[PDB]
Symmetry: C3
Subunit: 246 residues, 3 copies
């Protein structure tokens, strides 16, 4: 169902738009499977620097909460969705290439947990955000409880989880979730401002840094420096360290 | 020396008030044990689905650093005033049911740590927070420093820990010290607007996230994915999933 | 190389100033060591209560990302270059009293890594933060990837590290990078004001709270809670509690 084009300065920006408008980008197993293949075949591709994560068309980014609901099973098979859900939520946040959740339209349900998987959660001002997983009696399982609370904090993380109501993109700008609130079709052009300003930088000083921030939150301050100095030492062994010193 | 009222749609939400009005609902030895006994020692019943908390009177919530000066004892007699409040701040936030903090005017000193021992803090335009215990030679109460830095952050906590600054309640929302801001007169009804919404959704949908949320705030992220999976699996073993 | 002054009420505030304004006060391997002895290697004298740090010139605090950089050989010495910052950032973070950063102008690169190590940051209206160290080719040196993940947030800290650019004080005010933003004409005077409220406070309460918080950010809430209680009864034998 996925789509992709590869074009930028020196050939390529990995535009990924989940294309299945009938169910409004609902996150099933297949829409969770092909993401791995399209993001792990992209793992060893040296011709793509920056990745933008957007939704197809003009309807929504992902609306799998109140649209995709077939979970009438025993609880044993629920873990298989939990294991598969965690196989997709973190594999986007662990791709070395900087990925941006270029959110447009509705981004609740799976998209509520998928949007928080990128680096900068820049979203369309049309985005109505929320986590309507609790309204059916089940807390989010793909990582919406232990990843959100480290982004906006804990004072506000309770409000959008305990309640289960939809909030706007402008309202989300006061909590630190969305790092920039900007229009949707400009977000197509305005992301390219930030999708090649990133590319205009080095090729190793960005992804190697991504190995330090994405793993320094799980360790204390002293151990956090323990990973950063080697990364400072590792990027110190690149031809890009001395090329741009002019 | 207190009171509690429980009623909601299907009789789910509760309301507890510190009904000691004479000294403005301060925190001391005799009241702290009441708060730990009233919430019933780490757990509550199934009939109650949410516990709203505020201060009776429409005046200050708690003047815990203005008239409470029972602190002339030996250094071996301070554990009972330090550990008990930690126990007081241990299971107010960790009870197996959501708690909403209807902040109500003053929260100076020990009263603030009780407020920080709550989930959601619906504020009002009359509050005057602050922890001016450092001005007397002692850190804030019963876990102010560690909790506050986890809510607001590492930058804006030192500015309140070191100073004991006054600050208003409109700029308290500027730092994330509270969650929602509404007029004081409508605060009682506005707090109900959230409680009935937290009551009408589900029970297992919150209690299996309340346990998950209140355990992963300290450890790593992969460990944070540990309890959630077992909690998520546990929440599919109830008919509420099919409802 | 350096110039420091000390004059206020209670005789406890220190105005540490970097005195290399000709070269835009950019950090290197010889001025960082000059700032190690200035704070006296994890401790200081008994004549201080507060600390103020700000580069001399009133034009740029410590801009040292694209104004001064010499390392283009001997990649093994990068740890030797990275260790110096860690020794210069662990000393300030641990130091007995809080350090007030009255940054006025540019603060990028290694200089950006200095204000964030301070307890409280107050910036002038024309503040230009953000590390362009990524444009050079290597990630930030003595933190950046670490010290910014507990101040502003995990999402709004990626933007500065990845892109690499300069923003204004009001944006840093909005994101929370610098707590309070004041006009350049009312910052150096105001830095001498926030400290003076501290300077009239308890001597043992401010020092203990800094120790209690700076080592409680690194563990669990339950297991970092011990830091406060241990320091809680450490100030119950000094006259500050009673007098």
């Amino acid at each position: 169902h996925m789509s992709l084009v590869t074009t930028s300065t020196s050939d390529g920006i990995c535009t990924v738009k989940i294309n299945r408008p009938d169910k409004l980008n609902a996150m099933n197993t297949d829409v969770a499977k092909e993401l791995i293949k399209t993001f792990e075949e992209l793992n060893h591709n040296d011709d793509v620097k920056v990745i933008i994560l957007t939704g197809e068309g003009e309807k929504a980014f992902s609306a799998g909460a109140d649209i995709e609901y077939m979970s009438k099973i025993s609880a044993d098979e629920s873990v298989e969705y939990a294991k598969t859900g965690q196989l997709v939520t973190a594999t986007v946040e662990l791709v070395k290439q900087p990925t941006i959740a270029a959110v447009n339209g509705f981004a609740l349900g799976g998209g509520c947990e998928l949007a928080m998987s990128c680096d900068i959660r820049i979203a369309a001002d049309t985005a109505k955000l929320g986590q309507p997983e609790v309204t059916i009696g089940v807390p989010p399982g793909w990582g919406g409880t232990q990843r959100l609370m480290r982004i906006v904090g804990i004072a506000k993380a309770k409000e959008l989880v305990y309640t289960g109501k939809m909030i706007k993109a402008e309202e989300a700008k006061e909590i630190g979730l969305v790092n920039h609130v900007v229009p949707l079709a400009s977000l197509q052009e305005e992301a390219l401002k930030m999708a090649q300003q990133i590319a205009g930088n080095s090729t190793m000083g960005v992804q190697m840094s991504k190995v330090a921030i994405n793993k320094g939150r799980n360790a204390d301050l002293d151990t956090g420096l323990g990973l950063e100095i080697l990364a400072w030492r590792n990027c110190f062994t690149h031809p890009d360290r001395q090329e741009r010193m002019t």
